[PDB]
Design a protein around this ligand. Structure first.
Ligand SMILES: *[C@@H]1O[C@H](CO)[C@@H](O[C@@H]2O[C@H](CO)[C@@H](O)[C@H](O)[C@H]2NC(C)=O)[C@H](O)[C@H]1NC(C)=O
Ligand SMILES: Cc1cc(OCC(=O)NC(C)C)cc(C)c1Cl
Ligand SMILES: *[C@@H]1O[C@H](CO)[C@@H](O)[C@H](O)[C@H]1NC(C)=O
Lengths: 605, 47
């Protein structure tokens, strides 16, 4: 009903907008061609959405049809709210804290909330990009370390840890991570990891030191390289033995997985993370555009590009998974043939894949008590594809071992890690601007010490706070933080977004703005979504999440070298010592929202 | 050609002498420091 008095005294009026047109240039670096602006936006969106998130356990837990709801959920939450965003910054010529400071200053809570969310996201994406570039460093050599076990001091055999497990598994978990046996124990400083993280921070600083002007120069290649590499990796993927089995595995769904509604929750959280709304970055890009700049069509163009790139990534990754499964199945069948051949002294080349069962039963029927001691393996296809990684291994302990079975292994590994580097750089650009803009807009520092040193001090702050993940057990810490990235606070600021837009800001004003700078009166579905139907879903899914989470199943996997059937999974639940951290990391913003409102109510009303 | 009781033992390889990744990181760090210094010089020079 718009109960706010003096609603116009703070928003830039139409006459003021006309006057400020084409006269202000200081502190507001004008963009180049708007196509480059969409390029940066789409690159940041795909970079944040894809790496470490889509092919993560989100993709490999549903294992197939998981993605079908997601796309639908797109049109139920992506297009509307992204249309609600991408234009507030355009109208107000300011974002971050400006939007929620200039309108209804009583709450002003989404500002610091988005600040904290972006800082949390960056704090761990820096570790992720550090690991990616460390794996890049160890390339550029024919004998890739993740290809053969290191012989121990005996000079004739491998270590038991490397022998029982895989070579690549040992290289990731021991040579690089040096992971601990629990969370309670702390290891060394892992100097090489810290040095790599320092190099990552340095290159991120170099690629953006002055703001958008430096960012755009790098974007022209950062947002285009991965796209060119994905196609060549795909076309290499099809021309592989046993491929196109993963594709038909992905296409075929199971109904029972659709029946369980946790996949709905995961798809909603994933689309919200991927499109990167309620982050402050998009409003910050949009705050430096002309008033008459088109916004409705470029938004759907970006959305379609993101939706197609997701399908492309899924197709490539499942083609590789299918190739790996076929190779493993072939090796197992060859071993099964060889054991019978050795046991029964048959000619080599008589028992093939097509005539294995009949000969296997004929040898058994010839003479019992000699076939009995033979131990056969029951490996079968459609079960090797189902084996998925619990986390972080889909690009480190799976894709590398598939690379090692291809002709140009080092160069192809280099290209793969370069594409991951580029995507991580795009995401870091977006997050870094999204956190650094509100600090400058807050005017917490005087004109002196300009942005060149402000970015330096904030980047150093991030560098010296990110030492925790460099510890031996730090990986475990990351496991407990990523699961709280798209946590409750992000959803609550999301729920705040549109009801503040539709119940505080005049929707008629927004419509008049659309007819002013865009025209093409928005369709009925747009307003009905902006008012009702669309705002409720997230509330329902949040209530469903709250109902589900009462059945706590928190548990972090452990390497556990001192453990029988060592190449397996370890369940240890969680120590209560970190439980208080959930209190620290979650629920803080709710303390600050009502304070100013109650203070004003008791001071004036 | 296996003799079923005699196993090969003299096959130890060692190709990389000293940590080529160290030299790769060194050249990357050099290139990135050059970028830092040129960017800061251009920034402080542009009035
Ligand atoms: C092959 O080895 C199995 C190992 O037991 C035996 O098969 C028996 O006969 C039929 C096979 O259809 C089964 O119902 C029995 O359970 C099997 N075990 C027995 C009787 O102890 C047998 O040595 C061989 N069977 C054939 C068909 O060659
Ligand atoms: C873009 C991409 C992401 C991806 O996800 C795995 C992953 O994120 N690993 C990081 C944790 C390093 C896998 C693949 C093959 C590709 Cl192409
Ligand atoms: C149903 O999804 C589950 C995953 O738990 C799995 O057992 C199977 O791949 C699917 N069912 C069939 C018949 O394929």
């Amino acid at each position: 009903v718009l109960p706010n008095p003096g609603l116009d005294a703070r928003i830039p009026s139409l006459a003021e907008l006309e006057t400020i047109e084409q006269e202000e240039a200081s502190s507001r670096p004008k963009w180049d061609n708007k196509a480059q602006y969409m390029l940066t936006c789409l690159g940041f969106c795909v970079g944040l959405g894809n790496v470490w998130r889509f092919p993560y356990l989100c993709q490999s837990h549903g294992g197939g049809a998981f993605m079908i709801p997601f796309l639908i959920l797109l049109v139920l939450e992506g297009i509307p709210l992204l249309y609600l965003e991408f234009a507030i910054g355009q109208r107000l010529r300011r974002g971050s804290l400006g939007v929620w400071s200039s309108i209804h200053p009583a709450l002003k809570g989404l500002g610091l909330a988005s600040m904290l969310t972006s800082f949390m996201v960056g704090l761990y994406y820096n570790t992720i990009i550090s690991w990616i570039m460390w794996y890049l460093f160890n390339s550029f050599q024919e004998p890739l370390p993740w290809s053969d076990c290191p012989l121990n001091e005996n000079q004739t055999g491998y270590v038991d840890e490397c022998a029982r497990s895989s070579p690549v598994d040992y290289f990731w978990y021991r040579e690089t991570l040096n992971i601990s046996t629990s969370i309670s124990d702390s290891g060394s400083i892992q100097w090489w990891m810290l040095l790599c993280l320092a190099c990552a921070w340095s290159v991120l600083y170099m690629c953006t030191i002055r703001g958008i002007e430096t960012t755009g120069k790098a974007v022209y290649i950062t947002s285009t390289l991965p796209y060119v590499v994905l196609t060549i990796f795909l076309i290499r993927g099809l021309t592989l033995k046993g491929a196109t089995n993963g594709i038909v595995f992905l296409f075929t769904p199971n109904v029972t997985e659709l029946a369980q509604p946790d996949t709905w929750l995961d798809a909603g959280a994933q689309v919200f993370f991927s499109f990167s709304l309620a982050f402050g970055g998009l409003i910050s890009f949009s705050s430096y555009n002309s008033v008459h700049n088109n916004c409705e069509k470029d938004s759907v163009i970006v959305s379609i590009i993101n939706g197609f790139t997701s399908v492309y990534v899924a197709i490539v990754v499942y083609s590789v998974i299918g190739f790996r499964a076929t190779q493993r199945y072939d090796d197992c069948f060859s071993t099964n043939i060889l054991t019978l051949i050795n046991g029964f002294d048959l000619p080599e080349g008589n028992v093939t894949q097509e005539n294995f069962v009949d000969m296997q039963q004929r040898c058994n029927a010839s003479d019992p008590a000699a076939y009995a001691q033979l131990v056969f393996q029951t490996c079968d296809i459609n079960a090797f594809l189902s084996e998925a990684v619990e986390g972080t291994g889909l690009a480190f302990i799976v894709f590398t071992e598939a690379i090692t079975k291809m002709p140009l292994s080092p160069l192809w590994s280099v290209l793969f890690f370069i594409m991951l580097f580029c995507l991580g750089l795009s995401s870091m650009f977006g997050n870094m601007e999204g956190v650094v803009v509100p600090l400058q807009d807050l005017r917490v520092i005087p004109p002196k010490w300009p942005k060149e040193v402000l970015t330096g001090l904030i980047c150093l702050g991030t560098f010296l706070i990110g030492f925790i993940f460099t510890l031996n057990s730090g990986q475990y810490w990351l496991s407990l933080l990523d699961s709280y990235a798209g946590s409750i606070p992000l959803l609550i600021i999301a729920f705040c977004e549109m009801f503040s837009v539709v119940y505080v800001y005049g929707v008629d004003r927004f419509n008049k703005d659309i007819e002013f700078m865009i025209g093409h009166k928005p369709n009925i579905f747009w307003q009905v979504t902006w008012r009702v139907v669309s705002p409720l879903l997230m509330l329902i899914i949040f209530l469903f999440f709250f109902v589900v989470e009462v059945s706590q199943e928190l548990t972090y996997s452990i390497w556990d070298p001192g453990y029988e059937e060592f190449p397996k999974s370890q369940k240890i639940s969680y120590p209560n010592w970190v439980y208080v951290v959930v209190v620290i990391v979650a629920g803080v913003p709710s303390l600050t929202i009502p304070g100013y409102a109650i203070y004003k109510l008791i001071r004036n009303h | 050609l296996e003799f079923l009781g005699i196993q090969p033992t003299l096959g130890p390889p060692n190709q990389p002498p000293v940590s080529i990744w160290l030299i790769v990181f060194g050249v990357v760090m050099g290139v990135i420091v050059v970028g830092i210094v040129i960017l800061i010089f251009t920034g402080i020079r542009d009035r």
